[PDB]
Amino acid sequence: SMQLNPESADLRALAKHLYDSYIKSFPLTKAKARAILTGKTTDKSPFVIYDMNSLMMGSKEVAIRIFQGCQFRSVEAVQEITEYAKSIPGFVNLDLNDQVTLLKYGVHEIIYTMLASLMNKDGVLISEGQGFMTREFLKSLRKPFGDFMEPKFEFAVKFNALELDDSDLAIFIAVIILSGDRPGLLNVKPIEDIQDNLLQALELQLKLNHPESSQLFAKLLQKMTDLRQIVTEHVQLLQVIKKTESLHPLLQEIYKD
Numbered sequence: 544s545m546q547l548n549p550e551s552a553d554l555r556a557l558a559k560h561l562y563d564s565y566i567k568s569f570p571l572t573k574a575k576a577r578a579i580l581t582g583k584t585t586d587k588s589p590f591v592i593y594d595m596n597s598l599m600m601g602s603k604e605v606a607i608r609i610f611q612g613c614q615f616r617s618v619e620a621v622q623e624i625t626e627y628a629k630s631i632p633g634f635v636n637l638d639l640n641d642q643v644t645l646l647k648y649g650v651h652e653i654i655y656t657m658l659a660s661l662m663n664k665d666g667v668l669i670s671e672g673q674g675f676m677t678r679e680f681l682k683s684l685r686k687p688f689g690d691f692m693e694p695k696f697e698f699a700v701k702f703n704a705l706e707l708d709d710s711d712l713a714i715f716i717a718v719i720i721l722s723g724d725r726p727g728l729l730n731v732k733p734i735e736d737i738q739d740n741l742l743q744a745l746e747l748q749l750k751l752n753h754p755e756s757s758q759l760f761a762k763l764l765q766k767m768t769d770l771r772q773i774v775t776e777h778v779q780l781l782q783v784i785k786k787t788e789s790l791h792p793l794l795q796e797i798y799k800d
Protein backbone atom coordinates (compact mmCIF):
# COMPACT_ATOMS: atom_id res chain seq x y z
CA SER A 544 0.00 0.00 0.00
CA MET A 545 3.00 2.31 0.80
CA GLN A 546 3.54 2.83 -3.01
CA LEU A 547 0.97 3.85 -5.74
CA ASN A 548 2.37 2.37 -9.02
CA PRO A 549 1.31 0.05 -11.91
CA GLU A 550 1.14 -3.07 -9.62
CA SER A 551 -1.01 -1.33 -6.90
CA ALA A 552 -3.20 0.11 -9.76
CA ASP A 553 -3.63 -3.45 -11.21
CA LEU A 554 -4.63 -4.71 -7.68
CA ARG A 555 -7.33 -1.90 -7.41
CA ALA A 556 -8.69 -2.84 -10.91
CA LEU A 557 -8.98 -6.54 -9.81
CA ALA A 558 -10.84 -5.24 -6.64
CA LYS A 559 -13.18 -2.93 -8.68
CA HIS A 560 -13.84 -5.77 -11.20
CA LEU A 561 -14.67 -8.31 -8.40
CA TYR A 562 -16.93 -5.72 -6.62
CA ASP A 563 -18.84 -5.02 -9.92
CA SER A 564 -19.43 -8.83 -10.46
CA TYR A 565 -20.45 -9.15 -6.74
CA ILE A 566 -23.16 -6.48 -7.35
CA LYS A 567 -24.40 -8.16 -10.63
CA SER A 568 -24.37 -11.67 -8.99
CA PHE A 569 -25.58 -10.86 -5.40
CA PRO A 570 -28.89 -8.90 -5.29
CA LEU A 571 -29.11 -8.47 -1.46
CA THR A 572 -25.67 -6.87 -0.67
CA LYS A 573 -24.47 -6.30 2.93
CA ALA A 574 -25.01 -2.49 2.52
CA LYS A 575 -28.77 -3.16 1.73
CA ALA A 576 -29.13 -5.89 4.42
CA ARG A 577 -27.72 -3.36 6.97
CA ALA A 578 -30.15 -0.63 5.78
CA ILE A 579 -33.19 -2.98 6.33
CA LEU A 580 -31.83 -4.32 9.70
CA THR A 581 -31.37 -0.68 11.01
CA GLY A 582 -34.71 0.62 9.52
CA LYS A 583 -33.11 3.20 7.10
CA THR A 584 -34.74 1.84 3.84
CA THR A 585 -38.45 2.32 2.90
CA ASP A 586 -37.68 -0.10 -0.03
CA LYS A 587 -39.56 -2.88 1.86
CA SER A 588 -40.32 -3.45 5.60
CA PRO A 589 -39.81 -7.16 6.46
CA PHE A 590 -42.30 -9.30 8.53
CA VAL A 591 -40.83 -10.68 11.80
CA ILE A 592 -41.29 -14.46 12.46
CA TYR A 593 -40.63 -14.67 16.27
CA ASP A 594 -43.09 -17.50 17.32
CA MET A 595 -45.48 -20.17 15.82
CA ASN A 596 -48.15 -17.39 15.60
CA SER A 597 -45.87 -15.22 13.34
CA LEU A 598 -44.71 -18.18 11.12
CA MET A 599 -48.33 -19.12 10.10
CA MET A 600 -49.28 -15.41 9.49
CA GLY A 601 -46.16 -15.56 7.18
CA SER A 602 -45.69 -29.40 15.50
CA LYS A 603 -42.56 -30.65 13.56
CA GLU A 604 -44.29 -29.67 10.22
CA VAL A 605 -42.86 -26.12 10.93
CA ALA A 606 -39.32 -27.67 11.28
CA ILE A 607 -40.04 -29.28 7.82
CA ARG A 608 -41.26 -25.91 6.38
CA ILE A 609 -38.18 -23.93 7.61
CA PHE A 610 -35.57 -26.64 6.63
CA GLN A 611 -37.38 -26.60 3.21
CA GLY A 612 -37.01 -22.75 3.07
CA CYS A 613 -33.21 -22.97 3.74
CA GLN A 614 -32.78 -25.63 0.97
CA PHE A 615 -34.56 -23.26 -1.57
CA ARG A 616 -32.38 -20.22 -0.63
CA SER A 617 -29.31 -22.61 -0.42
CA VAL A 618 -29.89 -23.62 -4.13
CA GLU A 619 -30.59 -19.93 -5.03
CA ALA A 620 -27.26 -19.03 -3.26
CA VAL A 621 -25.21 -21.74 -5.12
CA GLN A 622 -26.35 -20.22 -8.50
CA GLU A 623 -25.32 -16.72 -7.25
CA ILE A 624 -21.79 -18.03 -6.31
CA THR A 625 -21.44 -20.06 -9.61
CA GLU A 626 -22.22 -16.83 -11.60
CA TYR A 627 -19.67 -14.86 -9.45
CA ALA A 628 -16.90 -17.52 -9.79
CA LYS A 629 -17.09 -17.20 -13.65
CA SER A 630 -16.13 -13.47 -13.27
CA ILE A 631 -12.88 -14.14 -11.25
CA PRO A 632 -10.07 -13.62 -13.82
CA GLY A 633 -8.42 -16.98 -14.71
CA PHE A 634 -11.04 -19.20 -12.96
CA VAL A 635 -12.62 -20.43 -16.26
CA ASN A 636 -9.12 -21.32 -17.75
CA LEU A 637 -8.60 -24.33 -15.36
CA ASP A 638 -9.63 -27.99 -16.05
CA LEU A 639 -13.47 -28.20 -15.69
CA ASN A 640 -12.50 -30.94 -13.13
CA ASP A 641 -10.93 -28.25 -10.81
CA GLN A 642 -13.52 -25.46 -11.46
CA VAL A 643 -16.39 -27.80 -10.37
CA THR A 644 -14.08 -29.06 -7.50
CA LEU A 645 -13.22 -25.52 -6.23
CA LEU A 646 -17.04 -24.87 -6.18
CA LYS A 647 -18.09 -28.27 -4.66
CA TYR A 648 -16.04 -27.40 -1.49
CA GLY A 649 -16.38 -23.54 -1.53
CA VAL A 650 -20.14 -22.72 -1.94
CA HIS A 651 -21.11 -23.58 1.70
CA GLU A 652 -18.12 -21.51 3.02
CA ILE A 653 -19.30 -18.49 0.91
CA ILE A 654 -22.94 -19.20 2.02
CA TYR A 655 -21.99 -19.03 5.77
CA THR A 656 -19.79 -15.93 5.02
CA MET A 657 -22.53 -13.96 3.17
CA LEU A 658 -25.24 -15.31 5.60
CA ALA A 659 -23.52 -13.09 8.25
CA SER A 660 -24.35 -10.08 5.99
CA LEU A 661 -28.08 -10.96 6.54
CA MET A 662 -27.72 -11.44 10.37
CA ASN A 663 -27.68 -9.38 13.56
CA LYS A 664 -27.83 -10.51 17.25
CA ASP A 665 -31.71 -10.75 16.92
CA GLY A 666 -32.06 -12.96 13.76
CA VAL A 667 -31.60 -13.32 9.95
CA LEU A 668 -33.14 -11.65 6.83
CA ILE A 669 -34.95 -14.25 4.60
CA SER A 670 -36.73 -14.10 1.16
CA GLU A 671 -34.52 -11.23 -0.19
CA GLY A 672 -35.33 -8.97 2.83
CA GLN A 673 -39.14 -9.66 2.89
CA GLY A 674 -38.93 -11.54 6.23
CA PHE A 675 -36.76 -11.69 9.39
CA MET A 676 -36.65 -14.94 11.46
CA THR A 677 -35.36 -14.58 15.07
CA ARG A 678 -32.36 -16.51 16.46
CA GLU A 679 -34.37 -17.52 19.61
CA PHE A 680 -37.32 -18.81 17.47
CA LEU A 681 -34.93 -20.89 15.27
CA LYS A 682 -33.37 -22.18 18.58
CA SER A 683 -36.84 -23.27 19.84
CA LEU A 684 -37.53 -25.83 17.00
CA ARG A 685 -38.03 -29.58 17.86
CA LYS A 686 -34.67 -31.46 18.41
CA PRO A 687 -32.44 -31.68 16.58
CA PHE A 688 -33.43 -28.72 14.32
CA GLY A 689 -33.23 -25.95 17.01
CA ASP A 690 -29.39 -26.14 16.78
CA PHE A 691 -29.36 -25.97 12.93
CA MET A 692 -28.67 -22.17 12.62
CA GLU A 693 -27.22 -21.34 16.10
CA PRO A 694 -23.59 -22.05 15.01
CA LYS A 695 -24.13 -19.85 11.86
CA PHE A 696 -25.25 -17.00 14.26
CA GLU A 697 -22.20 -17.75 16.53
CA PHE A 698 -19.89 -17.31 13.51
CA ALA A 699 -21.79 -14.18 12.32
CA VAL A 700 -21.45 -12.05 15.51
CA LYS A 701 -17.62 -12.59 15.56
CA PHE A 702 -17.40 -12.10 11.72
CA ASN A 703 -19.62 -8.95 11.65
CA ALA A 704 -17.37 -7.39 14.39
CA LEU A 705 -14.62 -7.32 11.64
CA GLU A 706 -16.99 -4.70 10.02
CA LEU A 707 -16.24 -5.77 6.43
CA ASP A 708 -18.10 -4.08 3.51
CA ASP A 709 -19.17 -5.52 0.12
CA SER A 710 -15.80 -4.43 -1.45
CA ASP A 711 -13.95 -6.37 1.30
CA LEU A 712 -16.16 -9.51 0.94
CA ALA A 713 -15.94 -9.50 -2.91
CA ILE A 714 -12.15 -10.18 -2.75
CA PHE A 715 -12.39 -12.43 0.39
CA ILE A 716 -15.08 -14.63 -1.29
CA ALA A 717 -12.83 -14.91 -4.40
CA VAL A 718 -9.85 -15.92 -2.15
CA ILE A 719 -11.97 -18.79 -0.63
CA ILE A 720 -13.06 -20.18 -4.08
CA LEU A 721 -9.38 -20.18 -5.36
CA SER A 722 -8.18 -22.48 -2.48
CA GLY A 723 -5.23 -24.72 -3.54
CA ASP A 724 -5.81 -27.35 -0.79
CA ARG A 725 -9.26 -28.66 -1.98
CA PRO A 726 -9.37 -32.49 -2.18
CA GLY A 727 -8.62 -33.98 -5.65
CA LEU A 728 -7.33 -30.84 -7.44
CA LEU A 729 -5.22 -31.48 -10.61
CA ASN A 730 -3.39 -28.13 -11.29
CA VAL A 731 -2.77 -26.59 -7.81
CA LYS A 732 -0.13 -24.08 -9.10
CA PRO A 733 -2.34 -21.94 -11.42
CA ILE A 734 -4.96 -21.74 -8.54
CA GLU A 735 -2.21 -20.72 -6.00
CA ASP A 736 -0.87 -18.10 -8.48
CA ILE A 737 -4.44 -16.66 -8.88
CA GLN A 738 -5.02 -16.74 -5.03
CA ASP A 739 -1.60 -15.08 -4.31
CA ASN A 740 -2.74 -12.18 -6.62
CA LEU A 741 -6.20 -12.15 -4.82
CA LEU A 742 -4.46 -12.17 -1.35
CA GLN A 743 -2.33 -9.20 -2.61
CA ALA A 744 -5.56 -7.40 -3.71
CA LEU A 745 -7.28 -8.17 -0.30
CA GLU A 746 -4.24 -6.98 1.77
CA LEU A 747 -4.21 -3.66 -0.18
CA GLN A 748 -8.08 -3.41 0.00
CA LEU A 749 -8.00 -3.91 3.84
CA LYS A 750 -5.20 -1.31 4.41
CA LEU A 751 -7.05 1.37 2.29
CA ASN A 752 -10.52 0.55 3.70
CA HIS A 753 -9.65 -0.05 7.44
CA PRO A 754 -7.10 2.62 8.56
CA GLU A 755 -7.29 1.92 12.36
CA SER A 756 -7.84 -1.90 12.17
CA SER A 757 -4.87 -4.03 13.44
CA GLN A 758 -4.00 -7.39 11.79
CA LEU A 759 -7.50 -7.36 10.10
CA PHE A 760 -5.85 -9.24 7.17
CA ALA A 761 -4.61 -12.05 9.52
CA LYS A 762 -7.93 -12.01 11.46
CA LEU A 763 -9.86 -12.45 8.15
CA LEU A 764 -7.55 -15.30 6.93
CA GLN A 765 -8.12 -17.08 10.32
CA LYS A 766 -11.95 -17.10 9.62
CA MET A 767 -11.29 -19.66 6.80
CA THR A 768 -10.59 -22.07 9.71
CA ASP A 769 -13.93 -21.26 11.48
CA LEU A 770 -15.73 -21.79 8.09
CA ARG A 771 -14.30 -25.31 7.39
CA GLN A 772 -15.50 -26.19 10.95
CA ILE A 773 -19.09 -24.88 10.46
CA VAL A 774 -19.30 -27.04 7.25
CA THR A 775 -17.99 -30.19 9.08
CA GLU A 776 -20.25 -29.45 12.15
CA HIS A 777 -23.19 -28.89 9.69
CA VAL A 778 -22.59 -32.22 7.78
CA GLN A 779 -22.77 -34.00 11.21
CA LEU A 780 -26.26 -32.36 11.67
CA LEU A 781 -27.44 -33.42 8.13
CA GLN A 782 -26.00 -37.01 8.50
CA VAL A 783 -28.28 -37.25 11.62
CA ILE A 784 -31.19 -35.63 9.60
CA LYS A 785 -31.07 -38.60 7.09
CA LYS A 786 -30.78 -41.34 9.82
CA THR A 787 -33.40 -39.65 12.12
CA GLU A 788 -36.14 -38.51 9.62
CA SER A 789 -35.17 -35.62 1.91
CA LEU A 790 -32.46 -33.27 0.40
CA HIS A 791 -32.83 -31.38 -2.97
CA PRO A 792 -30.59 -33.40 -5.33
CA LEU A 793 -28.18 -30.45 -6.13
CA LEU A 794 -27.29 -30.28 -2.36
CA GLN A 795 -27.14 -34.16 -2.34
CA GLU A 796 -24.61 -33.97 -5.29
CA ILE A 797 -22.28 -31.42 -3.49
CA TYR A 798 -22.38 -33.71 -0.36
CA LYS A 799 -20.49 -36.70 -2.01
CA ASP A 800 -17.02 -36.28 -0.39
Ligand SMILES: CC[C@H](Cc1ccc(C(=O)NCc2ccc(OC)cc2C(F)(F)F)cc1)C(=O)O
Pocket residue numbers: 608609610612613614616617620654658667668669670676681692781794
Ligand atom coordinates in the same frame (compact mmCIF):
# COMPACT_ATOMS: atom_id res chain seq x y z
C1 LIG B 1 -30.17 -26.67 4.35
C2 LIG B 1 -29.24 -25.53 3.94
C3 LIG B 1 -27.76 -25.80 4.25
C4 LIG B 1 -26.92 -24.51 4.24
C5 LIG B 1 -27.74 -23.24 4.39
C6 LIG B 1 -27.94 -22.39 3.32
C7 LIG B 1 -28.65 -21.22 3.47
C8 LIG B 1 -29.19 -20.86 4.70
C9 LIG B 1 -29.98 -19.60 4.84
O1 LIG B 1 -29.91 -18.71 4.00
N1 LIG B 1 -30.77 -19.50 5.92
C10 LIG B 1 -31.69 -18.40 6.10
C11 LIG B 1 -33.09 -18.73 5.63
C12 LIG B 1 -33.44 -18.51 4.30
C13 LIG B 1 -34.71 -18.80 3.83
C14 LIG B 1 -35.66 -19.30 4.70
O2 LIG B 1 -36.93 -19.39 4.19
C15 LIG B 1 -38.00 -19.67 5.11
C16 LIG B 1 -35.33 -19.55 6.03
C17 LIG B 1 -34.05 -19.27 6.50
C18 LIG B 1 -33.75 -19.58 7.95
F1 LIG B 1 -34.68 -20.36 8.51
F2 LIG B 1 -33.70 -18.48 8.71
F3 LIG B 1 -32.57 -20.21 8.11
C19 LIG B 1 -28.98 -21.72 5.78
C20 LIG B 1 -28.27 -22.89 5.62
C21 LIG B 1 -27.18 -26.77 3.24
O3 LIG B 1 -27.00 -26.48 2.06
O4 LIG B 1 -26.90 -27.94 3.75
